[PDB]
Symmetry: D2
Subunit: 256 residues, 4 copies
């Protein structure tokens, strides 16, 4: 089954940044034909810590940029919504509607995403036990979603720290396809980078259906997640490595 790689800059800082990253992703999709790539970027960071941090350029602008990426490269698209009303407009361009970790339990947002007919990817809340994502998936099916993903992005471990409990991959696999978020799982809420690659290797060795990675031409200048966004030039090598580890580990993946 085709492995999923969801990647892109954290925030749609501009339509130019989007096309620049989109070009590299299109190139990788041509090389890694056994992979299904999905371009990701948020039209809005609705929950930055500080009121002074970069949020975005609006839904309208974001959707237009994302659509430009899709038209120009033939890339599938995914972006996250924050309130029910955003589902409809976003569904016009997004192949996969993403649900933020903090909102994984908001019934109406989930129902709004499901009725669009698009695929839905829910980031598992940092407060949520893996066995409790069962009802999240149940809500989505109830709302009409036929293609569902659950994304592992770490769990609250003391203050300002997240730990990844890899037991969650096979548990959530019982009711949905599982994606490992390599970027936000090492982030210190409220170092980090050096742990991205090692945990990604662990994820594919344990077994998942896809990986999610934020990447930017020059992370040091990103308007959000600068410290954890992967340098764009490193994406190819990371992908090649996980496909290699995936292949050799695959014969041992347990049947759920």
């Amino acid at each position: 089954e085709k492995f999923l790689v969801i990647a892109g800059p954290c925030a749609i800082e501009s339509e130019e940044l989007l096309l620049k990253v989109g070009e590299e992703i299109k190139r990788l999709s041509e090389k890694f034909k056994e992979v299904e790539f999905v371009f990701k970027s948020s039209f809005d960071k609705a929950n930055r810590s500080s009121i002074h941090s970069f949020r975005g350029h609006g839904l309208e602008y974001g959707v237009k940029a994302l659509r430009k990426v899709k038209e120009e490269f033939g890339l599938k698209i995914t972006t996250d919504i924050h309130e029910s009303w955003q589902a409809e407009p976003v569904a016009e361009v997004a192949d996969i509607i993403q649900i933020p970790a903090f909102l994984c339990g908001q019934t109406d947002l989930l129902l709004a995403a499901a009725k669009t007919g698009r695929a839905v990817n829910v980031k598992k809340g940092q407060f949520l036990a893996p066995w409790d994502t069962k009802n999240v998936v149940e809500k989505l099916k109830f709302g009409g979603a036929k293609e569902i993903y659950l994304t592992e992005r770490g769990t609250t471990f003391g203050y300002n720290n997240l730990v990844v409990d890899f037991r969650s991959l096979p548990i959530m696999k019982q009711w949905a396809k599982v994606i490992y978020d390599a970027t936000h799982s090492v982030q210190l809420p409220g170092g980090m980078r050096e742990f991205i690659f090692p945990l990604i290797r662990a994820a594919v060795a344990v077994g998942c259906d896809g990986v999610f990675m934020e990447t930017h031409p020059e992370p040091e200048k990103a308007l959000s997640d600068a410290s954890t966004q992967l340098p764009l030039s490193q994406l190819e090598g990371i992908i090649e490595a996980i496909l290699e580890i995936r292949e050799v580990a695959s014969k041992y993946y347990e049947t759920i």
Copy 2:
């Protein structure tokens, strides 16, 4: 003065709200020293199961709360779940409540501040005490003047919440602090026996108010049945925390 926010978890019916409102009114008359605020949610927006009780709607709920504020002259507070609900709710609500999961949603906070009403944010289970500083700033930026931060527990492994009381003095540096006595002991996903003990700790440590869900018959509650306090037990607990506070206040640190 000391704040006591109480009421049934969900607006099961304006009838139930009036029965609880009557008692809160009575206690209100008995403890003139305490500022009571009637609380109840018009919608349980994040029940684990799709097949659970959510409520009767915003309109029916606002109308029911209006009836309590009118019949008993009590202050009101209910929680909002999306930005568009702030204004209609602000018609009745004296204090707008922000759910713990949504404590970081900038637009929800700004829409709350914009109504001019008081705003009470439940500290997320994922949030460090010192990180509530930015939450308060967003509300100030948005024009909020009366701001409350409510302690409701912190994620401790799976399906468990622990109350780190160090948070009370930390959050107090930038806002009035309320202690949520009922959601702080519930396991997410012994509960009741621990509500009063931890309530006593909160007042011994020092807080500006206490938040408690109460129901005539918690057993039959449509939400949080396991943790809602029997209405008949409310007076005794209020008297107990006022006596403890009277003695302990002598030692509350300045900060």
Copy 3:
């Protein structure tokens, strides 16, 4: 029932330090007659982080100093043991044998303490759930202990941090007398001081049978726990406050 106050310098830095603190504790015992005071100090810090930190002056020296305190002031004594063989010699002076948090599950150390006929106080491990102290008490009874205490000293909460779950007081009270350790519960493993008094108020409001506090004439010069040891001149006020909070909260203590 007489409230227990266990206090003293963390480590027996010298016999002079011991007599100096012992004098203040004797004075307080005369004032607070409704309190049972127990003088505490370790003849050895058997698990400092660094091999270079202060450990002590030996079992022999320590026991002799502790005995001097007992003879000179009529104060009850408590100190901790680290290996089974230490129980016998230590029992000659200690009225209460303390079991370190990390060793709360070592069957032989527990059995060695119990057969001395002395009272035993076990610090609850930072890894231990409160309902699991039941078997610790069972082991002690099996070994002959008739007077047992369980001491709350925090729980592992992420890295380098402890949280106090006050629900543990009424749970452990089901099988033993409970003591709240005001000093080590705010310590950051591997600020702190400002939280000592507030958490002590919480402990007595919830309800316990005693409090444990480390105190030193000049904390800033202590050879161990300098940051969290309470200034000796502050002890009287802390004790007075907890007796006041205890009295007003007492009528509400639940029956276990």
Copy 4:
């Protein structure tokens, strides 16, 4: 070379030790690339219950391990619980194992180093990865030269352990790192189904060896029955981690 430490949890009888030793010997002959070490405890010093199996004593245990080292020529490792046991154990044990709870007991570490043998410390459930640096220093001070740190999980709420794999590269800065595949998934106080998945993660991330308890019939084990790996399953798992390591080693960071 890669380390594989395996054996039954408790020395239930030198007989059982010989049956397991035979298989480890065979695998030893099959995977010449791997350094096998036979492991078994002569005493379960911290069972929750006083009415549980502890063992048959240090003398009986050392004798039984001696029989394995003699009959099969395999290296040995057992854990000590108090300082006085280091020397007698060092007669047979090639590697002295320090229990996770006692990883901070200076005298136990020093007595272990003094025997001149190799020392493997299980990282406490309460210990941060970076704080293992001082543990290693105590052993060096004590004369230890071959030092191992073993990852066995971290306290995550009550009765639960989580494995933070970030610890593998952190501890590796000052010692060889071993991953304990069996105690890392046990709940203190799904287990088995998670042993192999996490073992795969450990080798994908990078470690110098793996630790696994195995028993001919775990169901009948006198200790850790729920988590000991069936002896017949050991070969397949070893082959699996060698293949994963062969491919993943290309990407292990230098550090």
